[PDB]
């Protein structure tokens, strides 16, 4: 999901 909430 970006943000470096996971890497997608």
Given at each position: ?8
């Amino acid at each position: 999901x970006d943000x470096x909430s996971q890497x997608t």
